[PDB]
């Protein structure tokens, strides 16, 4: 589908919309628990946002093709590092603390670059769905902090711990793009009672164009001692170090898995820190039995 005007009932943001900024449309929602939506027309929006709406909010970006992130024309950008902002969350260009939030075809970036942690988006709520979005940074790009989250046909770009936190999160058909040496995931799963996983499924892991990172990228390292991550049914380019995984938390006992991956970085013979698994995990394991209620199936 093309989405070139506001879907039914949505507030409009843009040069020729009701609101000039995304923040103004968010503010206009006020204190309601009704479901709502906002359509954002093409543009670069220099804004830092907290999504804390009480109801179920959907944020749609304009695009000629909703099925991909590649034609996105809406970018939300802001630049600050966590040392300057005061916390990881306060560094985020977009901070999602509203359950049931969905975002379609929007690009989110932190323009800080290499040198310190600078979050593009923090997901800190349950039943979060992201479809055809881009998330760009260097260190700590995508803070999957907590809650059940689903990313489909997204582009996640970074270098150092650029998917990190304790969300239970499923990445499907995403392009995961390294723009520097480092570990892709940094799960903070920390106790046995924590039922969370990161699952990277039918994804494509590769270098950013123009950057040579042969064997300089790790699938992950453990931010806390019980980090749990599986890469399955995915393509891994030659960026992946033969060891696969590296270290971080002292005394870590990570649960790190690979299943049915292909590509030049998919040879497992020299891996370290892995555990055997005989089948891929499913979304019921990662997100719970109710995932069919909130995930956009039609997408
Ligand atoms: Cl919190």
Automatic annotation (TrEMBL):
The record ties this protein, via Gene3D superfamilies, to: Single-stranded right-handed beta-helix, Pectin lyase-like
| Locations listed in the record | Secreted
Pectinesterase catalytic domain span? 15-285
Question: What InterPro entries does this protein map onto?
Answer: Pectin_lyas_fold, Pectin_lyase_fold/virulence, Pectinesterase_Asp_AS, Pectinesterase_cat
Report the top EC class in one word.
hydrolase
- Report the pathway entry: Glycan metabolism; pectin degradation; 2-dehydro-3-deoxy-D-gluconate from pectin: step 1/5
Q: Which key words are in the record?
A: Aspartyl esterase, Cell wall biogenesis/degradation, Hydrolase, Secreted, Signal
Under Enzyme Commission nomenclature, its number is: 3.1.1.11
| Keyword check for Cell wall biogenesis/degradation | yes
One Pfam family cited in the UniProt record for this chain: Pectinesterase
Q: Name one GO cellular component term.
A: extracellular region
Domain of life where this protein originates? Eukaryota
Keyword match Signal: yes
Reaction(s) this enzyme catalyzes, per UniProt: [(1->4)-alpha-D-galacturonosyl methyl ester](n) + n H2O = [(1->4)-alpha-D-galacturonosyl](n) + n methanol + n H(+)
- Can you list the disulfide-bonded cysteine pairs? 10-37
GO process annotations (BP): cell wall modification; pectin catabolic process
Active-site residues, as the UniProt record annotates them: 161
Q: What does this protein do?
A: Involved in maceration and soft-rotting of plant tissue.
Tell me which family the UniProt entry assigns to this protein.
Belongs to the pectinesterase family.
Annotated protein name in UniProt: Pectinesterase
Q: Which organism is it from?
A: Aspergillus niger (strain ATCC 1015 / CBS 113.46 / FGSC A1144 / LSHB Ac4 / NCTC 3858a / NRRL 328 / USDA 3528.7)
Species classification: Eukaryota, Fungi, Dikarya, Ascomycota, Pezizomycotina
């Amino acid at each position: 589908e093309s989405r070139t005007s506001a879907p039914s009932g949505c507030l409009t943001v843009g040069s020729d919309g009701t609101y000039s900024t995304i923040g103004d449309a968010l503010d206009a929602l006020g204190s309601s628990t009704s479901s709502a939506c906002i359509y954002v027309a093409s543009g670069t929006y220099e804004e830092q946002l907290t999504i804390d709406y009480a109801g179920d909010l959907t944020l749609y970006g304009e695009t000629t093709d909703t099925s991909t992130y590649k034609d996105n024309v809406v970018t939300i950008t802001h630049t600050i590092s966590s040392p300057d902002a005061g916390s990881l969350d306060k560094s985020a260009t977009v901070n999602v603390v509203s359950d049931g939030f969905s975002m379609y075809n929007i690009n989110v970036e932190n323009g800080y670059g290499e040198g310190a942690q600078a979050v593009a988006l923090v997901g800190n709520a349950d039943q979060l769905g992201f479809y055809g979005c881009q998330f760009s940074g260097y260190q700590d790009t995508l803070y999957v902090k907590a809650g059940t989250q689903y990313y489909s046909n997204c582009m996640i770009e970074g270098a150092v711990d650029y998917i990190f936190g304790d969300a239970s999160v499923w990445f499907g058909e995403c392009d995961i793009v390294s723009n520097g040496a480092g570990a892709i995931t940094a799960s903070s799963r920390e106790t046995s009672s924590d039922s969370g996983w990161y699952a990277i499924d039918n994804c494509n892991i590769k270098a950013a164009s123009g950057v040579s990172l042969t064997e300089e990228v790790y699938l992950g390292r453990p931010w806390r001692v019980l980090a749990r991550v599986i890469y399955q049914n995915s393509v891994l380019s030659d960026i992946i170090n033969p060891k696969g995984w590296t270290t971080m938390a002292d005394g870590a006992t990570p649960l790190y898995y690979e299943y049915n991956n292909s590509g030049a970085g998919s040879d497992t013979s020299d891996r370290e820190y892995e555990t055997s698994i005989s089948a891929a995990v499913d979304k019921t394991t990662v997100l719970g039995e109710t995932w069919g209620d909130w995930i956009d199936r039609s997408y």
